[PDB]
Amino acid sequence: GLPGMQNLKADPEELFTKLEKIGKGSFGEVFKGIDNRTQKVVAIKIIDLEEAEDEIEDIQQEITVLSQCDSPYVTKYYGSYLKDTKLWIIMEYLGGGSALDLLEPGPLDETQIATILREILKGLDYLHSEKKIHRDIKAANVLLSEHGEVKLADFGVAGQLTDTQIKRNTFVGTPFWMAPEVIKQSAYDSKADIWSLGITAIELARGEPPHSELHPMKVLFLIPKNNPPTLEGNYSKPLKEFVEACLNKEPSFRPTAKELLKHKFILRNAKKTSYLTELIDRYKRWKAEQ
Ligand SMILES: Cn1cc(-c2c[nH]c3ncnc(N4CCOCC4)c23)cn1
Known part of the structure; x- marks a missing residue:
């Protein structure tokens, strides 16, 4: 039942x-x-x-x-x-709304990006330790409470790994955030969520993921064919490196969520979640216009 x-x-x-x-x-x-x-x-x-x-x-x-x-x-x-x-x-x-909605008034600063990514990484570390794969990691699926707490939502395509099923092959997710091995339907695991996290890091920094102006059918050949996306623009070397770490075509070369919690980008920039109320308040004030 x-x-x-x-x-x-x-x-x-x-x-x-x-x-x-x-x-x-x-x-x-x-x-x-x-x-x-x-x-x-x-x-x-x-x-x-x-x-x-x-x-x-x-x-x-x-x-x-x-x-x-x-x-x-x-x-x-x-x-x-x-x-x-x-x-x-x-x-x-979750009354703060999605991280996608919070990008509307304007860009995030690197402290906000690092804080949101650290909390997403906590969620992924929990899921991966439970042998669960989210498979739809993106800013729309990252929700904030009114107090700035960050949580993962939408388990509509979530996968379960077992001792008898160590890998999955189902084609699921949102095209722009999908890992190359998921698109190709190769055997994959929790590392697919690490790739989607890298795309989400670009989305939090730039406002949209790579290839956002293209038709999703085009990205189904572009993602496996092209070298991985990189974060372009005036962003810190730790942030660009955090992105590159996630966005490797070889899944075994991607770090685990637990390892990424100790990445220099996170440790040097993340602050208490309570500071994210400033981001929620900005969105409330911006909406109080429109
Ligand atoms: C993707 N997804 C998010 C939830 C969800 C749970 N709690 C919420 N509190 C507040 N807002 C929400 N969202 C806002 C965005 O649309 C969707 C519902 C939610 C469910 N699915």
């Missing part, structure tokens, strides 16, 4: 006050909501199961993976409720 699936007499329309749409996730739309018993804000992903076919296997896999994570770096899963044909997935609400 479905982990965290609640009783069918539990009416989620009664238990939760469904508010405004806040975005989209894998399989459905995400709404801001209120838990009517505690009055805490939650994120609610609603999936129309009637509108799905050969996607339910993937929906169940997402819920299974989320239910298995217990980390301050991964969005918490509170349970699932079925209302007629709609599945309500209750998740932790």
Whole structure:
């Protein structure tokens, strides 16, 4: 069965006050909501199961993976409720928004980049130690709380490694952030997330990943064919080296998340997450215009 699936007499329309749409996730739309018993804000992903076919296997896999994570770096899963044909997935609400949204008022400085990457690395180190592969690491899937806490979201394509299945070969992810071995469907592991982290580092520095102006079909030949992307522009030598470390075509040449937590870029520039409230406040003020 479905982990965290609640009783069918539990009416989620009664238990939760469904508010405004806040975005989209894998399989459905995400709404801001209120838990009517505690009055805490939650994120609610609603999936129309009637509108799905050969996607339910993937929906169940997402819920299974989320239910298995217990980390301050991964969005918490509170349970699932079925209302007629709609599945309500209750998740932790992160009021600072995605790192992608936070880039809107303008560029990040290197302290902000290093802080966000360090927290992503904490999440990846947790997942990889649990033999899990996120497979969709990008700034849109990096969420911040109102206090500046950074967490990984969207386990829609997450993979599980076992003692009998040491590697995966499925073609999954978002083209621009995909590792060459994933695109080529070669046997891959946690190192694919290290490549996606390198692309996310470029995205946090420049605002977009490499080849962002090209059609995603073109990048399916460009990524395996071309030398890896590099970070171009007036950025620190440690930041450019952090990017190059992640973005090696040879997966065994990429460091682990644990090793990257000790990279000179991180150690010299990262600061407390509480400082990221300045970034959230900037986005709030910028939105208070538009
Ligand atoms: C990709 N993804 C993020 C969540 C999610 C969980 N908690 C949230 N709190 C606040 N905002 C969110 N997002 C905002 C962006 O769109 C999507 C929902 C979320 C789910 N999937």
